[PDB]
Structure formats: C-alpha cells, structure tokens
C-alpha cells in the first residue's frame, strides 16, 4: 500500500567522462499530491568536476499525481516495484544512460541507480559547470511492448542566459502485470532548493502531475 506520506532512500553508483562517484540520499513526499523533496550527499569521488543538473533528474515516478481515470501504473507496481532505463542525448554529443530499480522495504521506497555519462566536450556546459537548473518540462507517456515509455525535450538553463538541451527517452517497467495506461503527459518542475559550495550536499524539490493529452 502507498501511504499518503512516504519516505525513500536512494543509492547511485556512477561515472561521468571517466570520473567515478557514489551518491547516498533520502527523501520524502506525498505520492498522491505529486510532491517530494530529497537530500543527496556525494559519498565517494567528491567534489564532482561536472554539473549536478545532469544527475538531478535521476533522483521518482511513484510521487506523480494522477487523475482517477489514468491508471497509476508505477504506484500499482508496489510492493514489488518497478525498473526504469533511460538515455539522454545532449545537443553537443554528450550521452547519459541510467538503469534504476525501485522497491518498497520496511514502509520506505528503496532506489538503486547506476549512471554512465560520456562524450561531453571538455569545454562544454556540463564539464565547465555552466548549467543553472532545468526549465519545467512535459514528458509524453505512452504504452509500448508491454511497458510505459516517456519522451522529453529537457531544457537546461545556462548561467549567462541561453539554454542547453537534451532528447530523453525512458522505459518504465513494473515487476508484475499491473494496469498500463493509454497515452498522456506528466508535467514536471524540479528545483535545486539548496547546495553547499562544491555541490557535495544538495537538496531538491519536485512536483509532477499526469494530465490528459
């Protein structure tokens, strides 16, 4: 059962342009309201020599507000949970892939994330830490191959004005047969609410809701 108030624990193992790191975090939210907050700590390989923003999106689709007529496929997947795999193709050739496992243990969501980032130019906004958060985006959700798929055009803001984009494609798959919905949009807004100087401690907030096309 997905309660009104839920905590989660996350562990990420990653590598960006060869730089290895581990992140440990915890968060909380209101799964039926579509709101959540997380506190992330770089536990290995800190400080990171790249933009935190490429990581921010990988830290929770069980906290998406759904209208009653759209089956909440990823909430229904629990206690077993679900798995997701993502590819983010950046406009300057940088590529990120993420594999994730979500489960429910002792009344809390447990997230296990693996991330690879490569081919970011040495002089690009990611490696030069020139990003300044993300614009609100809309993910186009649609069923296919017995899984839920999502497509997003992510727009990262640049510190001196201007944008830095990526094409994001994700597959979300429940660990048991649970009701897949028809096509729809999930509107996101993700904010970095606070960080220390070298981004080794970061707090994020997110609000997401599913809407009919």
């Amino acid at each position: 059962i997905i309660k009104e108030f839920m905590r989660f624990k996350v562990h990420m193992e990653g590598s960006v342009n060869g730089h290895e790191f581990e992140i440990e975090g915890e968060g909380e939210g209101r799964p039926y309201e579509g709101t959540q907050t997380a506190k992330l700590k770089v536990t290995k390989g800190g400080p990171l020599p790249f933009a935190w923003d490429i990581l921010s999106f990988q830290f929770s689709k069980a906290y998406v507000k759904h209208p009653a007529d759209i089956p909440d496929y990823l909430k229904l997947s629990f206690p077993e949970g679900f798995k997701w795999e993502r590819v983010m193709n950046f406009e300057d050739g940088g590529v990120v892939t993420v594999t994730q496992d979500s489960s429910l243990q002792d009344g809390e969501f447990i997230y296990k994330v693996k991330l690879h980032g490569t081919n970011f130019p040495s002089d690009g906004p990611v490696m030069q830490k020139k990003t300044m958060g993300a614009e609100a985006s809309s993910e186009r959700m649609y069923p296919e191959d017995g899984a839920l798929k999502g497509e997003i055009k992510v727009r990262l803001k640049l510190k001196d004005g201007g944008h830095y984009d990526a094409e994001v494609k994700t597959t979300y798959k429940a660990k048991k047969p649970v009701q897949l919905p028809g096509a729809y949009n999930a509107n996101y807004k993700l904010d970095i609410t606070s960080h220390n100087e070298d981004y080794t401690i970061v707090e994020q907030y997110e609000r997401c809701e599913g809407r009919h096309s």
Side-chain angles (χ1 to χ4, degrees):
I1 204 138
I2 306 305
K3 295 185 184 284
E4 301 285 304
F5 298 96
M6 298 289 273
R7 288 203 179 87
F8 72 83
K9 295 290 181 284
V10 52
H11 174 78
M12 173 193 278
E13 279 165 48
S15 174
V16 176
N17 273 22
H19 190 86
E20 289 182 278
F21 65 93
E22 283 191 22
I23 289 168
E24 300 246 71
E26 19 214 276
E28 52 173 279
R30 297 180 179 198
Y32 305 92
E33 181 177 285
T35 60
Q36 57 177 313
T37 59
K39 183 172 180 185
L40 303 314
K41 298 125 193 187
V42 184
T43 42
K44 286 165 190 206
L48 305 177
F50 56 92
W52 172 273
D53 292 312
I54 70 154
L55 305 187
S56 73
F57 309 95
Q58 332 306 340
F59 296 117
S60 184
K61 272 216 167 278
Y63 297 78
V64 177
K65 183 184 190 171
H66 280 77
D69 68 326
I70 303 179
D72 201 342
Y73 175 68
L74 302 169
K75 274 198 184 61
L76 290 167
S77 76
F78 290 97
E80 291 73 11
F82 65 95
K83 290 170 65 172
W84 61 257
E85 305 85 41
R86 174 172 290 163
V87 64
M88 311 174 79
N89 297 318
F90 291 85
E91 61 163 80
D92 62 357
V95 180
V96 166
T97 61
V98 193
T99 65
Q100 200 262 23
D101 191 292
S102 298
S103 53
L104 174 77
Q105 302 171 55
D106 297 296
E108 305 201 334
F109 293 121
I110 298 294
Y111 301 164
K112 184 189 187 180
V113 191
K114 285 172 186 196
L115 180 146
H116 288 168
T118 192
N119 203 45
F120 285 96
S122 56
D123 77 316
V126 175
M127 298 309 296
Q128 295 297 305
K129 296 167 79 182
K130 293 290 165 287
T131 68
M132 197 185 181
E135 287 285 350
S137 52
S138 186
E139 184 173 21
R140 183 51 178 187
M141 305 310 294
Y142 62 90
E144 184 184 64
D145 300 323
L148 191 58
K149 309 286 182 87
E151 290 183 357
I152 338 175
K153 170 70 99 199
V154 162
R155 290 180 90 229
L156 257 1
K157 287 175 252 136
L158 287 182
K159 279 167 188 196
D160 267 56
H163 289 94
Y164 175 60
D165 307 341
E167 193 96 49
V168 179
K169 173 70 178 292
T170 316
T171 295
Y172 310 89
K173 186 150 199 199
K175 288 164 185 182
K176 56 146 155 53
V178 281
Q179 196 48 22
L180 262 176
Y184 73 108
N185 310 307
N187 285 271
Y188 283 89
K189 207 176 183 206
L190 166 58
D191 285 280
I192 300 310
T193 58
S194 84
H195 61 88
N196 59 358
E197 195 262 302
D198 60 5
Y199 285 82
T200 59
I201 304 160
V202 182
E203 292 189 31
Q204 313 190 155
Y205 166 73
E206 180 183 272
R207 160 169 239 122
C208 190
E209 40 172 278
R211 326 265 305 164
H212 298 273
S213 185

